[PDB]
């Protein structure tokens, strides 16, 4: 029921009384997953049966200029499961992204394919979001995605989204 709105893009993040909880997470399949299904990159990639290459993610924090905090952007490689802890995600491949000095972190994910379970991208709290007085607590992250320059496709087909009347 959030899909039929503009709230479908806004990722809610606020102050949490725990510290190792999870903010978001999605399977890393550009075209099969329902998350980046109707994304422009998913739309170029639904016209082909074979595709390979890389993928960039970008995460932008749209809160105030006074808030600060840290996140843990873990990348579970394909074959590996989804971690259930901040600590289990910490021993994997992660990056600590400080809000108070970098409003955008870019995460170029290595080799991904569907015919050349592909991975996971999870986001864990590290610290709470520290806020001064008279500044609102609720804030927002927005994602961005595009390919890199090494992206190839091999066999054209009909798209699974246009249905004939």
């Amino acid at each position: 029921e959030n899909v039929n709105s503009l709230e479908a893009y806004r990722i809610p993040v606020h102050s949490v009384t725990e510290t190792g909880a999870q903010v978001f997470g999605f399977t890393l399949q550009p075209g099969a997953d329902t998350v980046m299904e109707r994304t422009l990159l998913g739309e170029i990639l639904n016209y082909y049966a074979n595709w390979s290459g890389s993928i960039k993610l970008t995460f932008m924090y749209c809160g105030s200029a006074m808030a600060t905090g840290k996140f843990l952007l873990a990348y579970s490689p394909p074959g590996a499961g989804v971690p259930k802890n901040r600590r289990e995600a910490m021993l994997g491949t992660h990056i600590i992204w400080d809000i108070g000095l970098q409003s955008s972190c870019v995460l170029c994910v290595p080799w991904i394919s569907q015919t050349h379970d592909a991975g996971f991208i999870t986001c864990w709290y590290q610290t709470s979001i520290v806020v001064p007085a008279e500044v609102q607590n609720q804030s927002v992250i927005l994602c961005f995605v595009s390919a890199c320059n090494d992206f190839s496709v091999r066999l054209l087909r009909d798209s699974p989204f246009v249905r004939q009347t």
Binding site: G25, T34, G81, S152, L156
Partner: protein, 227 residues
């Protein structure tokens, strides 16, 4: 690492059946003995979306006609009809229009025709870029003539022509209907100012109008877990 199949021409220059044209050789209603098609790119929804990736396009046209005939049942299936000749006349933008099978506009000079006898390879005729402006528009944000009169988003300027079909022979003694199939292959494609694909379905072939669809397929949660 090739990127030779993401070209514009390796994405748009492919043949596709766009329209089926049914007509007979003996009737009483004098308009079921022929049929027509106003040439556009807005009937196959696949090709309409693949051309609505871009705002302006510019292409040649290669049409191949697949012509098949089946006789209607009657008392007189036992007959010896000689081989049929079909006419496929092309009317450029600014040409006359026939109104029957016996009209004079099947005989006019500046309407190029093709005469095909049953049994051969299918016909083929190329159609060049025949617009006054520099490129066709898939989208046009405006009125054609004298705004707030005339239909919104028309663009008079990008008409390509129309076709007409009739059997060249006289009226036979048994009814024989002929259905042709039109393979529209655009050539030498150049495209400009790209734009996102359409999310909603189509409702008509002459406007962009729609009903609001969602954005994607909804999940149950926001955080993922294990299997």
């Amino acid at each position: 690492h090739v990127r030779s199949e993401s070209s514009v021409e390796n994405f748009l220059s492919r043949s596709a059946c766009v329209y089926i044209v049914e007509y007979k050789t003996r009737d009483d209603t004098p308009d079921k003995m022929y049929d027509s098609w106003v040439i556009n790119t807005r009937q196959v929804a696949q090709l309409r979306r693949k051309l609505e990736f871009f705002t302006y396009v510019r292409f040649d046209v290669e049409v191949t006609f697949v012509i098949t005939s089946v006789q209607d049942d009657s008392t007189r299936q036992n007959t010896d009809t000689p081989a049929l000749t079909h006419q496929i006349m092309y009317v450029p933008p600014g040409g006359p229009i026939p109104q029957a099978v016996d009209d004079y506009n099947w005989q006019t000079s500046t309407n190029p025709s093709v005469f095909w006898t049953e049994g051969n390879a299918p016909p083929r005729m190329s159609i060049p870029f025949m617009s006054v402006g520099n490129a066709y528009s898939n989208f046009y944000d405006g009125w054609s003539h004298f705004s707030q009169t005339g239909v919104y988003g028309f663009n008079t300027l990008n008409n390509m022509g129309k076709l007409y079909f009739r059997h060249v022979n006289d009226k036979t003694i048994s009814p024989i209907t002929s259905k042709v199939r039109i393979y529209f292959k655009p050539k030498h494609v150049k495209a400009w100012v790209p734009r996102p694909p359409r999310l909603c379905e189509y409702t008509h072939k002459d406007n962009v109008d729609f009903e609001p669809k969602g954005v994607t397929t909804s999940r149950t949660q926001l955080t993922i877990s294990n299997s």
